[PDB]
Amino acid sequence: DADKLPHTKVTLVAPPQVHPHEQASKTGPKVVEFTMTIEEKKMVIDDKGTTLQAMTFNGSMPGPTLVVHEGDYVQLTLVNPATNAMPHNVDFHGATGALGGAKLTNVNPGEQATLRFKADRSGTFVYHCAPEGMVPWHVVSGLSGTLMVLPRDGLKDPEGKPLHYDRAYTIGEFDLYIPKGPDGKYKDYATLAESYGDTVQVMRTLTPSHIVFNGKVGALTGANALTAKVGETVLLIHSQANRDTRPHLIGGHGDWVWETGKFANPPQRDLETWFIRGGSAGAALYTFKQPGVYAYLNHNLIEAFELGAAGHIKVEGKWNDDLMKQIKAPAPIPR
Amino acid sequence: DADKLPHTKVTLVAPPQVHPHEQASKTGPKVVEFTMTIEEKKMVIDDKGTTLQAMTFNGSMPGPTLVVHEGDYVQLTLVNPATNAMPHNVDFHGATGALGGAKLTNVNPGEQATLRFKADRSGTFVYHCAPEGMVPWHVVSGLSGTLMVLPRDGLKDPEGKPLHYDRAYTIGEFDLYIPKGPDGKYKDYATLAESYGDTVQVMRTLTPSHIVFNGKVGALTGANALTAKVGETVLLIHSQANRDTRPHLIGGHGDWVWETGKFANPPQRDLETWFIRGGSAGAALYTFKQPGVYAYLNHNLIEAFELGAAGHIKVEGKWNDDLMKQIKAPAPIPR
Amino acid sequence: DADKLPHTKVTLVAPPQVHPHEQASKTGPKVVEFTMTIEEKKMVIDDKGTTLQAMTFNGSMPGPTLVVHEGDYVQLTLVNPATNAMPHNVDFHGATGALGGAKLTNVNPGEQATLRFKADRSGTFVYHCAPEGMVPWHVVSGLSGTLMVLPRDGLKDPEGKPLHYDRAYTIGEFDLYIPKGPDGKYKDYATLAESYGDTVQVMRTLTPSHIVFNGKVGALTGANALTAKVGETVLLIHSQANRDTRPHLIGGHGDWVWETGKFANPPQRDLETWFIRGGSAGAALYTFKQPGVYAYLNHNLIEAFELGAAGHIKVEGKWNDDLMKQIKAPAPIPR
Ligand SMILES: [Cu+2]
Ligand SMILES: [Cu+2]
Ligand SMILES: [Cu+2]
Ligand SMILES: [Cu+2]
Ligand SMILES: [Cu+2]
Ligand SMILES: [Cu+2]
Ligand SMILES: [Zn+2]
Ligand SMILES: [Zn+2]
Ligand SMILES: [Zn+2]
Ligand SMILES: [Zn+2]
Ligand SMILES: [Zn+2]
Ligand SMILES: [Zn+2]
Ligand SMILES: [Zn+2]
Ligand SMILES: [Zn+2]
Ligand SMILES: [Zn+2]
Ligand SMILES: [Zn+2]
Ligand SMILES: [Zn+2]
Ligand SMILES: [Zn+2]
Ligand SMILES: [Zn+2]
Ligand SMILES: [Zn+2]
Ligand SMILES: [Zn+2]
Ligand SMILES: [Zn+2]
Ligand SMILES: [Zn+2]
Ligand SMILES: [Zn+2]
């Protein structure tokens, strides 16, 4: 019985970080409380100055990652401020009933609601907005993120041995549908409502103009690259709420991967490239053995290098000649 | 030896139902006899009045589901009436040899043939027409369905424990390629042969105009919604003979799923969204715990809500506040 | 320590064959030496005379398959002759560090380099060229192939029982992006550099003009069909370095399949159609039980029959009436 359990309040953090949490816990079930606020905002998504009339949870794409343990209850307060123009709600793939909660969280601008559900299944699960008659537009404009429900005794390999991570990162991949004018340049709209009709026409072609990690081309590069060090194990959470993708770490692997994202199933090992189905989140563990700059990308290489689906991980530490060695550097062909 | 076994005759039923059958059986192997008749027919596929020059098994899209047990023999009589214009045949992915049977069932209008094959592998398998030189057109125009071969001792979980369903439903998803004229409206053709050339041109773009469950937009809604009740376990069979899809139950899950559709492999549990490869059938079990109207859809949300890949399940019974509760209804933001 | 182990030199062979090798071996770890030479060349890819300005490893699409055992070291010499125009390198998905080796193998025309890496993970893995700023163009123009790393004690089923193959075949599937002129005919270019700008524009549509096995439409048909015989077990290696595909054997199955391509994971059995993610190689075993001409294809049937993704296997031996029998040949409908 839920209203008799202890409550705890969690403060969310912006992607690509994930808020502090315990993996294996001796703690009993809790009601874990969160809040999120919708923000409609225009956003620059590429190096040409192209804009998207965007819709976000807490101001970011993706929304923040929420983390609980199997058997906890999630209690979310969803706020839709009067500065917004549209109605919104939330569907948790991790929940059971009432269209994932969407039927109980319909909030017009100026309103809020509170939902509770039991997180009775372990894994990474998508959440997204789903207002009647406007579902795909709200999703592709930026309203999605991940709930992670960890098993109470932590992650396990196929033989039941313990697995861990030292840091977690969250990557949301967004297929965007930006309209063009008769001059062949991308259109810039004064309001969110004015972008609607033209955007639906692009969507129906099923061809994205851009595909970006965390809100823009190059979001996870330069000063904003992911980081790690040799010997450290990282969890990479990858959500795609609308379209399939195929993650790959250049110079690495997926040591243990749940591509369907559900921790009660055995992971697979040694993957070069894995597959996240549109409408889900998956998770990969990797332990760095070499330093350097890695690329993490969608391995449809057109989607990655032409359309935007790629980022960087900068890894410090000591080079290992046993794993790889330059025997002869590039030099003229002997004759 | 097959011609020495008992024969039984089965009467097929129209989708989305599946004909009565036993799951676990003590019965020994049988020769199980079926008949199907091809019908070429023009069909309205959307709410605008758009038509498809269609080709069907028994008058429906998909064709009916055929159910036998591992070790039975399937003996099908295929009839091509003289009212049809084209030659046809059948390829069972469940069979071994002769292009799945296609080489032995080539029937011109006015003809019939009878094929027998051993159903020696368990799972859900696609069948489809495949006439030399015209294969993709006949498949995308509607000629596909599912053969289910159940293990003799019923379905099993990864630990070998028994699994069951109380009702089965069959959903065929069809990517359609309808041509347009210079005014930008869909074309209506007087005959099947006249649609051919224009349709090939659309197909080569790889962009469907429509994607529909069971023959039309909204086929599985209103009076024709699927039904169930709290406590009941349903099997959802999903076939796609030409193109990938990603099934999802809104407010539910896949309790146990064989996404590749082959029952001798362990299922996965707790899936949010699964993946049916073009050219296959997969199967999901779910036990309802909450009443209400669920949506069952392809979670490329453009494909579902714009192009047609979505239906409804109406579930009766008692609401469960432990799984989900509205703590505070939508109301003004406190100030 | 690698520079203290025995060295062996291997001679590569052209696809669809794979060079002779042992499956299970009592041999200890070796440094296994290979060489490959890049060849830029114009190539006819269809029956209309269409050309591709191509880039290849050893003159073929795909590149040759390299085979070692888990714990061996791969030592490759990569040569870029002065007759070529562009810089090249190599990224092995099977390797750890330095962008899979790409950072250590940058060779301008007239140069060569030698790389060594430990093949410490079993499976089939893609290798491909990846020059800074030009990655997708070099990959889709033909620069990819497969490294197979076999477990030291051979392939195993989910229960640890031994599995074998009698012959191996390697199939590379290539999505091509050929530009058209204002008359709607495919363009023919005098040099590789002149095709670049127009080709990028086609790539960004994400719609291939052609999809071919081993370099052209019908590559693996007629005199160049694959072969086998009843009772023989074949391994079919399928690589796709840029785009998803869904292999199917018409009249057969995947007896045991590693669709993600990594041999330390249990295979699945009885598959009708499997899935190779863009940016990977997978492997299927099948034992022929019936003679005849099989088709092996991508089961997006438009991609196979309209765009080129299909080949043939000719199988000799004795027909088996227990598995399949024509009960009644095509004949007039009785009245
Ligand atoms: Cu919304
Ligand atoms: Cu959803
Ligand atoms: Cu037909
Ligand atoms: Cu087929
Ligand atoms: Cu290159
Ligand atoms: Cu790669
Ligand atoms: Zn309480
Ligand atoms: Zn509280
Ligand atoms: Zn907890
Ligand atoms: Zn819409
Ligand atoms: Zn650690
Ligand atoms: Zn980069
Ligand atoms: Zn008989
Ligand atoms: Zn009989
Ligand atoms: Zn039976
Ligand atoms: Zn055709
Ligand atoms: Zn039941
Ligand atoms: Zn609906
Ligand atoms: Zn040495
Ligand atoms: Zn040597
Ligand atoms: Zn070896
Ligand atoms: Zn490029
Ligand atoms: Zn053998
Ligand atoms: Zn053929």
Side-chain angles (χ1 to χ4, degrees), chain A residues 1-3 5-25 27-29 31-46 49-160 162-215 217-228 230-317 319-334, chain B residues 1-3 5-25 27-29 31-46 49-160 162-215 217-228 230-317 319-334, chain C residues 1-3 5-25 27-29 31-46 49-160 162-215 217-228 230-317 319-334:
Chain A
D1 198 294
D3 41 50
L5 292 168
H7 294 213
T8 296
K9 284 178 156 249
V10 171
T11 292
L12 297 160
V13 310
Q17 318 298 153
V18 186
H19 75 265
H21 60 280
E22 293 187 298
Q23 293 169 52
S25 63
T27 288
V31 180
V32 188
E33 295 178 10
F34 297 95
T35 70
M36 286 190 303
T37 300
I38 288 138
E39 187 184 358
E40 300 162 13
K41 85 210 259 187
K42 197 195 256 177
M43 221 170 327
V44 171
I45 66 178
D46 72 14
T50 304
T51 64
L52 166 64
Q53 278 287 1
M55 309 179 213
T56 70
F57 292 106
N58 274 9
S60 58
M61 292 160 64
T65 295
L66 285 62
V67 187
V68 302
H69 297 89
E70 186 184 343
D72 295 340
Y73 294 75
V74 174
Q75 183 162 300
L76 177 70
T77 292
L78 183 68
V79 188
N80 190 6
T83 46
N84 286 332
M86 311 293 324
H88 304 281
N89 64 26
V90 71
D91 173 350
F92 280 91
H93 290 182
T96 300
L99 302 184
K103 277 191 87 56
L104 307 175
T105 52
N106 284 303
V107 284
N108 289 316
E111 300 177 330
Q112 62 182 65
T114 302
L115 171 74
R116 187 184 70 200
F117 66 86
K118 198 184 193 170
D120 63 348
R121 295 163 193 264
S122 74
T124 49
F125 300 83
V126 164
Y127 66 83
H128 62 86
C129 187
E132 188 163 304
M134 349 185 182
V135 175
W137 183 40
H138 284 222
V139 177
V140 308
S141 299
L143 288 161
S144 70
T146 297
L147 169 73
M148 182 163 71
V149 185
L150 292 166
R152 294 220 156 255
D153 196 38
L155 299 176
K156 308 284 192 213
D157 91 0
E159 284 70 53
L163 291 175
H164 76 289
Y165 50 100
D166 302 306
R167 56 185 56 228
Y169 287 122
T170 191
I171 298 97
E173 176 175 346
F174 294 89
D175 50 313
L176 307 179
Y177 298 89
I178 310 297
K180 279 172 182 168
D183 61 7
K185 297 175 164 118
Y186 293 113
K187 286 179 85 171
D188 189 342
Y189 299 98
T191 64
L192 176 64
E194 288 170 281
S195 69
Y196 175 71
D198 287 348
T199 293
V200 165
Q201 289 308 289
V202 187
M203 292 168 70
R204 291 177 69 90
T205 73
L206 312 170
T207 303
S209 57
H210 307 250
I211 308 169
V212 297
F213 294 165
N214 298 29
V217 175
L220 300 180
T221 61
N224 297 298
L226 312 186
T227 65
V230 171
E232 200 168 36
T233 297
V234 302
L235 181 76
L236 300 173
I237 304 166
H238 201 120
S239 56
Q240 223 302 9
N242 194 57
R243 195 174 179 269
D244 303 326
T245 177
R246 55 213 60 71
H248 177 85
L249 184 60
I250 309 194
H253 297 87
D255 283 342
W256 289 110
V257 186
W258 294 269
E259 75 170 26
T260 47
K262 306 298 165 290
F263 300 135
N265 304 295
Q268 286 200 139
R269 59 172 291 133
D270 302 322
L271 305 194
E272 65 188 309
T273 298
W274 45 110
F275 191 67
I276 309 299
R277 297 139 188 70
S280 77
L285 289 166
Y286 186 58
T287 293
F288 291 97
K289 297 177 177 154
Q290 301 272 36
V293 181
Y294 296 63
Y296 179 69
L297 60 66
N298 170 346
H299 213 291
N300 181 316
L301 302 172
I302 307 167
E303 297 183 8
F305 287 104
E306 291 295 314
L307 308 191
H312 290 159
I313 317 192
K314 191 171 182 189
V315 185
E316 303 302 325
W319 183 259
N320 181 344
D321 255 10
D322 183 47
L323 298 176
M324 189 179 280
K325 196 174 165 196
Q326 193 182 54
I327 301 302
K328 313 233 171 190
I333 289 168
Chain B
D1 198 294
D3 41 50
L5 292 168
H7 294 213
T8 296
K9 284 178 156 249
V10 171
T11 292
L12 297 160
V13 310
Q17 318 298 153
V18 186
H19 75 265
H21 60 280
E22 293 187 298
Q23 293 169 52
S25 63
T27 288
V31 180
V32 188
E33 295 178 10
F34 297 95
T35 70
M36 286 190 303
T37 300
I38 288 138
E39 187 184 358
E40 300 162 13
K41 85 210 259 187
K42 197 195 256 177
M43 221 170 327
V44 171
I45 66 178
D46 72 14
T50 304
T51 64
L52 166 64
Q53 278 287 1
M55 309 179 213
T56 70
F57 292 106
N58 274 9
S60 58
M61 292 160 64
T65 295
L66 285 62
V67 187
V68 302
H69 297 89
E70 186 184 343
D72 295 340
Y73 294 75
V74 174
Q75 183 162 300
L76 177 70
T77 292
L78 183 68
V79 188
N80 190 6
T83 46
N84 286 332
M86 311 293 324
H88 304 281
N89 64 26
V90 71
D91 173 350
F92 280 91
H93 290 182
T96 300
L99 302 184
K103 277 191 87 56
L104 307 175
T105 52
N106 284 303
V107 284
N108 289 316
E111 300 177 330
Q112 62 182 65
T114 302
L115 171 74
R116 187 184 70 200
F117 66 86
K118 198 184 193 170
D120 63 348
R121 295 163 193 264
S122 74
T124 49
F125 300 83
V126 164
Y127 66 83
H128 62 86
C129 187
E132 188 163 304
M134 349 185 182
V135 175
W137 183 40
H138 284 222
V139 177
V140 308
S141 299
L143 288 161
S144 70
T146 297
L147 169 73
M148 182 163 71
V149 185
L150 292 166
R152 294 220 156 255
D153 196 38
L155 299 176
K156 308 284 192 213
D157 91 0
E159 284 70 53
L163 291 175
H164 76 289
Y165 50 100
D166 302 306
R167 56 185 56 228
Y169 287 122
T170 191
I171 298 97
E173 176 175 346
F174 294 89
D175 50 313
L176 307 179
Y177 298 89
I178 310 297
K180 279 172 182 168
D183 61 7
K185 297 175 164 118
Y186 293 113
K187 286 179 85 171
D188 189 342
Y189 299 98
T191 64
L192 176 64
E194 288 170 281
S195 69
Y196 175 71
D198 287 348
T199 293
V200 165
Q201 289 308 289
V202 187
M203 292 168 70
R204 291 177 69 90
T205 73
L206 312 170
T207 303
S209 57
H210 307 250
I211 308 169
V212 297
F213 294 165
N214 298 29
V217 175
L220 300 180
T221 61
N224 297 298
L226 312 186
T227 65
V230 171
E232 200 168 36
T233 297
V234 302
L235 181 76
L236 300 173
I237 304 166
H238 201 120
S239 56
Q240 223 302 9
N242 194 57
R243 195 174 179 269
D244 303 326
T245 177
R246 55 213 60 71
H248 177 85
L249 184 60
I250 309 194
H253 297 87
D255 283 342
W256 289 110
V257 186
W258 294 269
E259 75 170 26
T260 47
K262 306 298 165 290
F263 300 135
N265 304 295
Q268 286 200 139
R269 59 172 291 133
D270 302 322
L271 305 194
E272 65 188 309
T273 298
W274 45 110
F275 191 67
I276 309 299
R277 297 139 188 70
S280 77
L285 289 166
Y286 186 58
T287 293
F288 291 97
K289 297 177 177 154
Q290 301 272 36
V293 181
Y294 296 63
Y296 179 69
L297 60 66
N298 170 346
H299 213 291
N300 181 316
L301 302 172
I302 307 167
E303 297 183 8
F305 287 104
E306 291 295 314
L307 308 191
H312 290 159
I313 317 192
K314 191 171 182 189
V315 185
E316 303 302 325
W319 183 259
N320 181 344
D321 255 10
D322 183 47
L323 298 176
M324 189 179 280
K325 196 174 165 196
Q326 193 182 54
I327 301 302
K328 313 233 171 190
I333 289 168
Chain C
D1 198 294
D3 41 50
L5 292 168
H7 294 213
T8 296
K9 284 178 156 249
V10 171
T11 292
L12 297 159
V13 310
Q17 318 298 153
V18 186
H19 75 265
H21 60 280
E22 293 187 298
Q23 293 169 52
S25 63
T27 288
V31 180
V32 188
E33 295 178 10
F34 297 95
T35 70
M36 286 190 303
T37 300
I38 288 138
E39 187 184 358
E40 300 162 13
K41 85 210 259 187
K42 197 195 256 177
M43 221 170 327
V44 171
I45 66 178
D46 72 14
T50 304
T51 64
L52 166 64
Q53 278 287 1
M55 309 179 213
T56 70
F57 292 106
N58 274 9
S60 58
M61 292 160 64
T65 295
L66 285 62
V67 187
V68 302
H69 297 89
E70 186 184 343
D72 295 340
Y73 294 75
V74 174
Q75 183 162 300
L76 177 70
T77 292
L78 183 68
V79 188
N80 190 6
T83 46
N84 286 332
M86 311 293 324
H88 304 281
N89 64 26
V90 71
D91 173 350
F92 280 91
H93 290 182
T96 300
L99 302 184
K103 277 191 87 56
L104 307 175
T105 52
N106 284 303
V107 284
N108 289 316
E111 300 177 330
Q112 62 182 65
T114 302
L115 171 74
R116 187 184 70 200
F117 66 86
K118 198 184 193 170
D120 63 348
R121 295 163 193 264
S122 74
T124 49
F125 300 83
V126 164
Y127 66 83
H128 62 86
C129 187
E132 188 163 304
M134 349 185 182
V135 175
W137 183 40
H138 284 222
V139 177
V140 308
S141 299
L143 288 161
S144 70
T146 297
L147 169 73
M148 182 163 71
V149 185
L150 292 166
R152 294 220 156 255
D153 196 38
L155 299 176
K156 308 284 192 213
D157 91 0
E159 284 70 53
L163 291 175
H164 76 289
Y165 50 100
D166 302 306
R167 56 185 56 228
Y169 287 122
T170 191
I171 298 97
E173 176 175 346
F174 294 89
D175 50 313
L176 307 179
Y177 298 89
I178 310 297
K180 279 172 182 168
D183 61 7
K185 297 175 164 118
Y186 293 113
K187 286 179 85 171
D188 189 342
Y189 299 98
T191 64
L192 176 64
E194 288 170 281
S195 69
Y196 175 71
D198 287 348
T199 293
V200 165
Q201 289 308 289
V202 187
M203 292 168 70
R204 291 177 69 90
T205 73
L206 312 170
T207 303
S209 57
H210 307 250
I211 308 169
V212 297
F213 294 165
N214 298 29
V217 175
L220 300 180
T221 61
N224 297 298
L226 312 186
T227 65
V230 171
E232 200 168 36
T233 297
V234 302
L235 181 76
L236 300 173
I237 304 166
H238 201 120
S239 56
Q240 223 302 9
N242 194 57
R243 195 174 179 269
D244 303 326
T245 177
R246 55 213 60 71
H248 177 85
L249 184 60
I250 309 194
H253 297 87
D255 283 342
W256 289 110
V257 186
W258 294 269
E259 75 170 26
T260 47
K262 306 298 165 290
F263 300 135
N265 304 295
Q268 286 200 139
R269 59 172 291 133
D270 302 322
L271 305 194
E272 65 188 309
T273 298
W274 45 110
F275 191 67
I276 309 299
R277 297 139 188 70
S280 77
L285 289 166
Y286 186 58
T287 293
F288 291 97
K289 297 177 177 154
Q290 301 272 36
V293 181
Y294 296 63
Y296 179 69
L297 60 66
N298 170 346
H299 213 291
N300 181 316
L301 302 172
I302 307 167
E303 297 183 8
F305 287 104
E306 291 295 314
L307 308 191
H312 290 159
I313 317 192
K314 191 171 182 189
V315 185
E316 303 302 325
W319 183 259
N320 181 344
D321 255 10
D322 183 47
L323 298 176
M324 189 179 280
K325 196 174 165 196
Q326 193 182 54
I327 301 302
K328 313 233 171 190
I333 289 168

